[PDB]
Design a protein around this ligand. Sequence first.
Ligand SMILES: [Mg+2]
Ligand SMILES: [Mg+2]
Ligand SMILES: [Mg+2]
Ligand SMILES: [Mg+2]
Ligand SMILES: [Mg+2]
Ligand SMILES: [Mg+2]
Ligand SMILES: [Mg+2]
Ligand SMILES: [Mg+2]
Ligand SMILES: [Mg+2]
Ligand SMILES: [Mg+2]
Ligand SMILES: [Mg+2]
Ligand SMILES: [Mg+2]
Ligand SMILES: [Mg+2]
Ligand SMILES: [Mg+2]
Ligand SMILES: [Mg+2]
Ligand SMILES: [Mg+2]
Ligand SMILES: [Mg+2]
Ligand SMILES: [Mg+2]
Ligand SMILES: [Mg+2]
Ligand SMILES: [Mg+2]
Ligand SMILES: [Mg+2]
Ligand SMILES: [Mg+2]
Ligand SMILES: [Mg+2]
Ligand SMILES: [Mg+2]
Ligand SMILES: [Mg+2]
Ligand SMILES: [Mg+2]
Ligand SMILES: [Zn+2]
Ligand SMILES: [Zn+2]
Lengths: 77, 213, 112, 91, 31
Amino acid sequence: AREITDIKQFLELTRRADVKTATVKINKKLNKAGKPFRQTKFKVRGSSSLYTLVINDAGKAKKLIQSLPPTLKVNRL
Amino acid sequence: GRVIRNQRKGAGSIFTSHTRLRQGAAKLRTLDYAERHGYIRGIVKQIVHDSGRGAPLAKVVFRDPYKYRLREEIFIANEGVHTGQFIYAGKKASLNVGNVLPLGSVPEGTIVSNVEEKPGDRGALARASGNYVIIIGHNPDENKTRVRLPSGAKKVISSDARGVIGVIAGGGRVDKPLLKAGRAFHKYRLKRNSWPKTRGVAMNPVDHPHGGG
Amino acid sequence: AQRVTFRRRNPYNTRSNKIKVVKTPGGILRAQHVKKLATRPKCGDCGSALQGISTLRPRQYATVSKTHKTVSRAYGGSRCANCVKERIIRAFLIEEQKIVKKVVKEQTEAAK
Amino acid sequence: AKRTKKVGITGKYGVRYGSSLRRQVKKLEIQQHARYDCSFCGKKTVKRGAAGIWTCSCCKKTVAGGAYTVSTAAAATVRSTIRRLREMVEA
Amino acid sequence: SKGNAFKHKRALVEHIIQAKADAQREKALNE
RNA sequence: UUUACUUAUUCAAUGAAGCGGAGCUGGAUCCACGUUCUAGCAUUCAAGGUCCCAUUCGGGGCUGAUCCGGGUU
RNA sequence: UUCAAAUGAGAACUUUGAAGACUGAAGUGGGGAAAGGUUCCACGUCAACAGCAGUUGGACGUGGGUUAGUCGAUCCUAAGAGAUGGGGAAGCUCCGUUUCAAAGGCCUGAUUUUAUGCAGGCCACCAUCGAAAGGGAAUCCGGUUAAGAUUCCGGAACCUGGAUAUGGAUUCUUCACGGUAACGUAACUGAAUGUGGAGACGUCGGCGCGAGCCCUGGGAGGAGUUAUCUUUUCUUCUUAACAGCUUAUCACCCCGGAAUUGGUUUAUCCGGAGAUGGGGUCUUAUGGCUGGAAGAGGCCAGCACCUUUGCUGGCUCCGGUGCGCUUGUGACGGCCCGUGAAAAUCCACAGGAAGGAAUAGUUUUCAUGCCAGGUCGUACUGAUAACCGCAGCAGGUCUCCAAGGUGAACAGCCUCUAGUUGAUAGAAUAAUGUAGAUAAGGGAAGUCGGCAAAAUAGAUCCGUAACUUCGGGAUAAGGAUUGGCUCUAAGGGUCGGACGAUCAACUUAGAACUGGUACGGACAAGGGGAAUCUGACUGUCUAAUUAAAACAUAGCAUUGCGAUGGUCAGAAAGUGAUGUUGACGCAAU
RNA sequence: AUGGUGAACUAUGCCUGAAUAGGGUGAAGCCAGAGGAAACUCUGGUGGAGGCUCGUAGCGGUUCUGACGUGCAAAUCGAUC
Ligand SMILES: [Mg+2]
Ligand SMILES: [Mg+2]
Ligand SMILES: [Mg+2]
Ligand SMILES: [Mg+2]
Ligand SMILES: [Mg+2]
Ligand SMILES: [Mg+2]
Ligand SMILES: [Mg+2]
Ligand SMILES: [Mg+2]
Ligand SMILES: [Mg+2]
Ligand SMILES: [Mg+2]
Ligand SMILES: [Mg+2]
Ligand SMILES: [Mg+2]
Ligand SMILES: [Mg+2]
Ligand SMILES: [Mg+2]
Ligand SMILES: [Mg+2]
Ligand SMILES: [Mg+2]
Ligand SMILES: [Mg+2]
Ligand SMILES: [Mg+2]
Ligand SMILES: [Mg+2]
Ligand SMILES: [Mg+2]
Ligand SMILES: [Mg+2]
Ligand SMILES: [Mg+2]
Ligand SMILES: [Mg+2]
Ligand SMILES: [Mg+2]
Ligand SMILES: [Mg+2]
Ligand SMILES: [Mg+2]
Ligand SMILES: [Zn+2]
Ligand SMILES: [Zn+2]
């Protein structure tokens, strides 16, 4: 399993030919041992490796969910 | 009567040499055109211990005269030979310790080792640690050389027989008491099954002619 | 207090049957078989370990790129920097001495 | 503070093997465990690897020599004789 | 310290203080 | 009887590589003046020289590297 | 060993519950190797067997069950075994293992053409078998069964082989740039041939580091005790392979030029062949962060029911400590007349035969994409009942893991996890036994003989003779002490400029008080001395009556042998051991 | 006498593996101090040698008017060593 940090790279991975499925996972975590916050992991299932992009911003995560390609099969929660 | 150990040892069996850890047979180069007419230079790459042998050995690398490659030879190290030293072997080799020369090309009183008994057999005389052969004299008419062997015997051999200048390294080994059956055990474990020895008198008359009483 | 077992049918403490104890996500201890550690490649002239070369089992060298197995220098890999420098110096000096000796021998032949 | 009056290195043998044999072993053991000067790098760093093999820890030079000393008297005499014969042959 | 002259850290500190005082005294007397 | 010879037979080695004889071969009867301060390097029918070709990416001959033998040493 | 219930015609022996105990992590626990071969598990079931019984069983009857590209075999070679070419032998067959053999592969070619016939070159050594503990391509976690499990299911990886396309990189200076250098990178052509490395290596000792376990604090849950007390005792709070970034002892590079010699380890080595110092480079054992991955697993609470059916909520967090135990590993040191495997296989270098771009090439050692991985083993026991011993025999049989206390300690004793509670039973307590104890006064008067028992014993301190190979004798001998409690003193780390703040461990010494008939309170654990004979010592043998003064041993001494040889072997042989040897050797004593 | 079968027990050599708490004693090398012209001597440390030693696992098998003797066993059990 690999972790990706570039958003353009993540979009290219979602549009890659062998890619069919993605998973959206929601975690409840603590930032600097403070208030609770929401973390979103996008997991693209490639042929050889599984790619994970971690976003700590709920609004950016919602925008990325909206920007996901429509033919990609997304498994939420 | 029962077969004694002296007669039993001829069948081989458990009396063969223990040769797993040996470095290889210690021989001179094959007597070829280069050593017959000129000389050839090799390099001492390492000096190593051989299991079951008191004297150390030297790995000497030469160049193949007829093919692009290297040839490794196992010589018996003379005292004073070091790693990185150049060794010259042939009829035109210089009189320096470690060089291989024909017996006819050295003067009287020269001390040599690993001496060929016949020209081309690649070393037969004065191979154990501390031993050497003395060049007593020459007989040019018969192309012969008189030498003195470590046992004190005087021998006549061919002047084309080769020898290594110097004395075999590791001398003085037998001047140290072993002190221990264990040290004798480890000595003969790397050589052969000839230890410990049972006295014939202590045996029965069936086992040995010295037995009984 | 949790005791472990070999995960293979070799029950002896051989060089190829070494284990370590690891705690799993299941909350239990379990044996884990450890491969024999790799040896660093050595110089062909002095025998010292080669700087900048990856340390792998010999079959594993076929799986990595040429960067992990070489350095950017003549004899990179097989020989080390100091030995390469020494042989460069020796080559140049001996060639110069050969030229000098040939000139001296020609002059001596002419004068003789 | 000397710990033994006379046995020295042979104190590891205790009361065994006989006193004369212990003395004989002591001499050669001191010789074989001594440290010798290197004829190449000039340092006192040469020690015996195995019997007859003497290696310098610095400069990594290995020399063949005697079983318990670097150079034997017979080897030195042979060296002098070979030098004299070589000088006679050249001259 | 390798030759076992100081029993502990306090002994070493006291010896260092005494040695510095003696060195200062000798330097002042030779000045 | 004495003294020789090799071809039967016997022993040994090798990569059956340089053996034996001779050079209007050279230097001084003998030698290859082709290798000795140094832990380098030495491999692609060998570069060069000289006669041809049909010039064109190159290809041949002599030499480099003397000749002869009905005996691998 | 005991009580109750159930089953059953029948219960000391079966099942469940209730009790008392045991193995006490060098186990009566959890796995394996050899061996066995279905003994594994379910259902049915008691004639024979389980030296009593039996409703039970490793018994009897009927079936179910062992799933692999990654675990092994398969491949490699070790000591060795053994064809061919040859040579012996009447012969069954024997020698020998690369020789004594024409023992087989590759490159180029329109070969100056004689017309439809193969010419010119290159390199060379020997079949096969031999390890389920040696070498070796690559897999982990969770769940699942009556019995399978690194093999099945879910998820996530990796290796090998092959075809290939895209992206990336490189090129008009064709086969990359940067750094003084050590060297770095996502890449960055490579045939013959040669070379180097890895595979690949003894044992012991201390020191450093890591992992698992051990000990311990706060908090959030659950359980137990609560006659009195205890903010209490116990328990859950976990993170695999693989991948990215980062991480090091050693080693190396640049500057610089050292006596007032400095640096430095527990252990004394290093420096003009360039130290100390400053700045860098590298191996990634190992550790940390993140992905895997909380969705898993763990601990609790709350839902409806005949449900062989479904379903909801919370927490899973933050630390500390060490001459601790086990184990891995690093830099070292000690030892040898002992210096402590091979091969398959993989990589790299040197070399450059060659091939390759301008409006187009190259590079499958960079990334991504595609396809495939056969055969055989896989259940279970591994032993006071699954092996061997004619048996379900107190015997024998290789190995891995391993908690708390006391204590020097894998000792003895007690306990947690796990596992057993098996071996014919009941009632009485004569003599004689087997096993274990006590005894007034005397103390070897017993007996061939102090046989056997008793006495001694741990630790600390004082002290310790003859003799001696000077190393020992030696724990010689002979004396004093040891509990509990309350204290005192000494022995350190991390940060800051004479010291201050903070943190923490177990060693030693001393002083009061106090119980005592006992203080190594059980366990555990030398009796000592004066002499003689004898073998130097450590070691070895009569398995199943003799352990010794016997044998061996190191040291000493004699003899043979220079290979056309010594001592031996074979029926013979173009046969063999010493011999991968050479008098500082081999052989016979 | 002829012709065959055995080194699963055991004897020995070789090859490849594996196993072995906790204590006592305190060799060489090294450091510091006191002497000495030096060699060398003495004191205190460090270090951790030995076919050394006490003693588990293990290997072996000394002793007992020992247990047993159609024994658990065609060689076993207990203590001691
Ligand atoms: Mg007898
Ligand atoms: Mg008990
Ligand atoms: Mg108990
Ligand atoms: Mg019965
Ligand atoms: Mg059953
Ligand atoms: Mg059945
Ligand atoms: Mg045969
Ligand atoms: Mg095979
Ligand atoms: Mg294996
Ligand atoms: Mg199972
Ligand atoms: Mg699967
Ligand atoms: Mg199984
Ligand atoms: Mg099992
Ligand atoms: Mg049986
Ligand atoms: Mg049978
Ligand atoms: Mg009495
Ligand atoms: Mg009496
Ligand atoms: Mg009487
Ligand atoms: Mg005494
Ligand atoms: Mg004795
Ligand atoms: Mg007996
Ligand atoms: Mg006996
Ligand atoms: Mg005797
Ligand atoms: Mg056997
Ligand atoms: Mg002993
Ligand atoms: Mg003992
Ligand atoms: Zn080097
Ligand atoms: Zn040196």
